[PDB]
Amino acid sequence: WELTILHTNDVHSRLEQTSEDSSKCVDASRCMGGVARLFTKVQQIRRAEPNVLLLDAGDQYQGTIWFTVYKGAEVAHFMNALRYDAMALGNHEFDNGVEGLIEPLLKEAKFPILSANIKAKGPLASQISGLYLPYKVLPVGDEVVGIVGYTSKETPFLSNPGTNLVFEDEITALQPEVDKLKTLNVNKIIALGHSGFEMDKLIAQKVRGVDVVVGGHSNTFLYTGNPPSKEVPAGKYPFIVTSDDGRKVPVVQAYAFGKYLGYLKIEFDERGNVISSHGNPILLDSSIPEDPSIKADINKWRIKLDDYSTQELGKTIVYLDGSSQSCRFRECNMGNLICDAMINNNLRHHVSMCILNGGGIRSPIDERNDGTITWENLAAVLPFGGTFDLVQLKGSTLKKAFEHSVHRYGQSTGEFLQVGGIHVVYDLSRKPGDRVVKLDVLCTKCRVPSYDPLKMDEVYKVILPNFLANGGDGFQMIKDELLRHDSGDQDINVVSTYISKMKVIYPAVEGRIKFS
Amino acid sequence: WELTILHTNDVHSRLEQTSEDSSKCVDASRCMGGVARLFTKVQQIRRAEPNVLLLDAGDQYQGTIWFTVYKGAEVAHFMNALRYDAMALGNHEFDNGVEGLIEPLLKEAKFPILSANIKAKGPLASQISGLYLPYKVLPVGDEVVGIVGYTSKETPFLSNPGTNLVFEDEITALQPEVDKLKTLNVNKIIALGHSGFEMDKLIAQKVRGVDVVVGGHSNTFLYTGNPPSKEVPAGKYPFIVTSDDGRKVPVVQAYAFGKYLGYLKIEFDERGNVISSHGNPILLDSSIPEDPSIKADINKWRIKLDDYSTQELGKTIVYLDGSSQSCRFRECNMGNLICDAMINNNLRHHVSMCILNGGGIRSPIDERNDGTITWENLAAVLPFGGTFDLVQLKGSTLKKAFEHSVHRYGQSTGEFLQVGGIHVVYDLSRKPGDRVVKLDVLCTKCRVPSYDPLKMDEVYKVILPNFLANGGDGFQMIKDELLRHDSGDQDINVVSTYISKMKVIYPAVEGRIKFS
Ligand SMILES: Cn1c(=O)n([C@@H]2O[C@H](COP(=O)(O)CP(=O)(O)O)[C@@H](O)[C@H]2O)cc/c1=N\OCc1ccc(Cl)cc1
Ligand SMILES: Cn1c(=O)n([C@@H]2O[C@H](COP(=O)(O)CP(=O)(O)O)[C@@H](O)[C@H]2O)cc/c1=N\OCc1ccc(Cl)cc1
Ligand SMILES: [Ca+2]
Ligand SMILES: [Ca+2]
Ligand SMILES: [Zn+2]
Ligand SMILES: [Zn+2]
Ligand SMILES: [Zn+2]
Ligand SMILES: [Zn+2]
């Protein structure tokens, strides 16, 4: 029995074709992605493949202005237009709250949204009951296929799902549902969830009954061949997990931002045992044309958004590297911009130091043609919308924060820190906690202001975002050890006023972060 | 026969008491200098010493707004008020031109102005004839003392004396005049000039007849004891030059900016042979009170100047080190300010590089109380009033300019270069031309903007002042090798607009310049 699984994940409201760095498209001839382009390939596959399922493995919220304006409707309207079959809940579908998901998406969505490890209790459970399900049986061909959904068990520590929700462990919540499914004689079972390729490998091996594992949340790219763009692949597509019951479970994931459409052809038998499965992510590039019906429908909406973009801000002469591939591994100039901007707005209401988690930086801004910046640009960088809080810290506290900046370096980890007024040097041939080999911090009260070796028993004032000030990302030493805490100024607003003040900005890799 | 020589040099219109760094006074209790304070000590000495001469060895022009407003009158009126006996011409007395000296100073001055190596020829010689003399015989006590004047033989390459003047070699022009003096039976002979302690040591030994050598132009500080302030002394006061005719000629010089009054008691005999001479510069500090008659007369004028100062510009939170002691030896933050400001004003009309001769930086700005900056401040930094010209240069050309930046490092040399967008590392345990051990220059067209090793056969665009663009200070390779030259914007004006744009600036020693 043939079954073709089309799957997306981590679109982040990039329903509009984007530059290769998944940021606002500048030259359509090179641009790729978008719901419109995705439509023409799904449509094409459905033309030739009688048995098909289209599934998104979470994270359609946030990313671009398309969300912070329609705050959900854009996802529901165009996921329905693309006629998705199922979707597992992601962590970003709670960034606007439990009500910021129930009213816009769950109610207006024409298809099931799945998650098995999310238990609802209290006054809220009354109605959200049945607005999402732990699974769903889908009739394909003359057979049936069962999807079981899961979400990250760290969403209440990554998003805003309120307190009337509980996020259980995925495996311990999926297996009871999967047993239920096979006692209903639904052998063909797909696991679709938002926990991360590493946790998806835990489910594939340690859940009996699962036939496929489709997932996301870590923006992982798998390929069997020669990759088509700048994303270097982790493993082959599908990756094969040798489960504990003696089975070859395919693990699949297609990068992010709607740049690739996952495609997995699966051959079953009567008892629903996966004989084999070949596939590969499909780069939705310029060769695949936008579908006019969708493309125009997109511009029916873009008209509303144009008001935020058509307003001028300032100019940039160099490319602003806000890419996760550089802002979580080395000194990216986007962070240096944000940190230099940070220490300008406070100077009107005596600090010189700045730390910033590269994970907060969510989009690059491609300097092009005239090198002009807009709110649509700055918004894609900082979708969270917080403030830059002033914090009094011990030197010992800052020392360990930078040991936390590289404590698990190498896994695209978002807690890697950008700097301003700080010179840090790492040596990764040392065990976590000995990696910082030099740290010279800029002093101001000194008569010769300059970078000097950090003293452990000294008081420094650093400006960092609210999310760090409260010990996010695992910086619990900051939240607990700080000597004072002051309120900040809206994050995107002040960076907008800064670059408007400058009128031209050229941040560079100045050697703030170095490696030994 | 007793004769007390009081001498000043390199006041640079600092007739107003100044902070210890010779910049605008902030707390009078600590402030020192000024014509008023100088008056009460000269007056005191004349009360007790029957035979005295007061002489300035050049450089009363420029330095502060007092000049760029009254452009000479302030010097004439208060040098007369201090009742100077003679003065040798300095190089800065031509910064406003030959007419910018004849009308304000030479005509209105009630005393002789001396220089022997300045020959006047052409249409100008007609009147400037006799407005200054090569020497003068002064009656002191019941005897006579002869002063011979000299100026730097590099003034037409340091100032603007026009083309109708000629600056001869000092020695070859002094000795003929000194012979004339001793054939007139004026044995007591003082040499007063503006060429530099090193050239004054040439005159003392190689001019027969000279009894004393009083000079300046290098702002040298000599002391016999324990110095009273931050200036570390070169030698003892007086320094003794063992002349070629077998004589102990005293070489004297008192720092600068009116901070010390030189004081040299000299014992002669009938034939006018210097038996001995003891003395020491007198720190005109707060203990010596301002003379009310002068102090008030100073405020009679300050009223006119207040208009430039009482206008706001911006703020600074850190001390701006514009001191020659740091801006000609290492990375001073005043230069980094000027270079960062330089690459902001051009960005409105694509460069990132900046070189700047520390000699152009002529005053620090002391961040105090509220850390507010004014035109009176910015003017004292850049008395020259030029522009910041854009220049296209080869990489090989920039390489040798930095070898010229330290080619004779160690002598308070003004051709030492400040940077912006450049990382230079020197190693002075190498012969001039091998001292640059590393140079990484910031690139912008590169997709990862950052500092990269300078390529010799590559084209870079640096912004530097007009004085450098025309190969000043010995940078003749720049003037000759550049590939293009563009006009600049007024130097002080744009730095004012910058810091006004910033509203707070905190330049620091970031490690642009380093030493191995
Ligand atoms: C600011 N912030 C953040 O920078 N992060 C960064 O994202 C990283 C995770 O990103 P990822 O690895 O790409 C997975 P994704 O979050 O895109 O699903 C973390 O490491 C951290 O650096 C996470 C949460 C977070 N804030 O969470 C609270 C919050 C959520 C939504 C809204 Cl509208 C307002 C406040
Ligand atoms: C700009 N400039 C300069 O920076 N310098 C710097 O001064 C240094 C000499 O200073 P110093 O050793 O302290 C003796 P002083 O000139 O104070 O008598 C040089 O090395 C050089 O870096 C010299 C000449 C110079 N410009 O000379 C042309 C000029 C003169 C007056 C006016 Cl109003 C306009 C244009
Ligand atoms: Ca099965
Ligand atoms: Ca004699
Ligand atoms: Zn994501
Ligand atoms: Zn996610
Ligand atoms: Zn001088
Ligand atoms: Zn001079």
Swiss-Prot record, chains A, B:
Entry keywords, A to Z: Cell membrane, Disease variant, Disulfide bond, Glycoprotein, GPI-anchor, Hydrolase, Lipoprotein, Membrane, Metal-binding, Nucleotide-binding, Signal, Zinc
Cofactor: Zn(2+)
Residues that, per the record, bind IMP: 328, 357, 362, 384, 467, 473
Paired cysteines (S-S): 25-31, 327-332, 339-354, 443-446
Catalytic reaction(s) noted: a ribonucleoside 5'-phosphate + H2O = a ribonucleoside + phosphate; a 2'-deoxyribonucleoside 5'-phosphate + H2O = a 2'-deoxyribonucleoside + phosphate; dTMP + H2O = thymidine + phosphate; CMP + H2O = cytidine + phosphate
An annotated Gene Ontology molecular function: GMP 5'-nucleotidase activity
Primary subcellular site in the record, as a coarse category: membrane
Family matches, as InterPro entries: 5'-Nucleotdase_C (IPR008334), 5'-Nucleotdase_C_sf (IPR036907), 5'-Nucleotdase_CS (IPR006146), 5_nucleotidase/apyrase (IPR006179), Calcineurin-like_PHP_ApaH (IPR004843), Metallo-depent_PP-like (IPR029052)
Chain's role: Catalyzes the hydrolysis of nucleotide monophosphates, releasing inorganic phosphate and the corresponding nucleoside, with AMP being the preferred substrate. Shows a preference for ribonucleotide monophosphates over their equivalent deoxyribose forms. Other substrates include IMP, UMP, GMP, CMP, dAMP, dCMP, dTMP, NAD and NMN.
Complex formation: Homodimer.
Protein name: 5'-nucleotidase
Underlying gene: NT5E
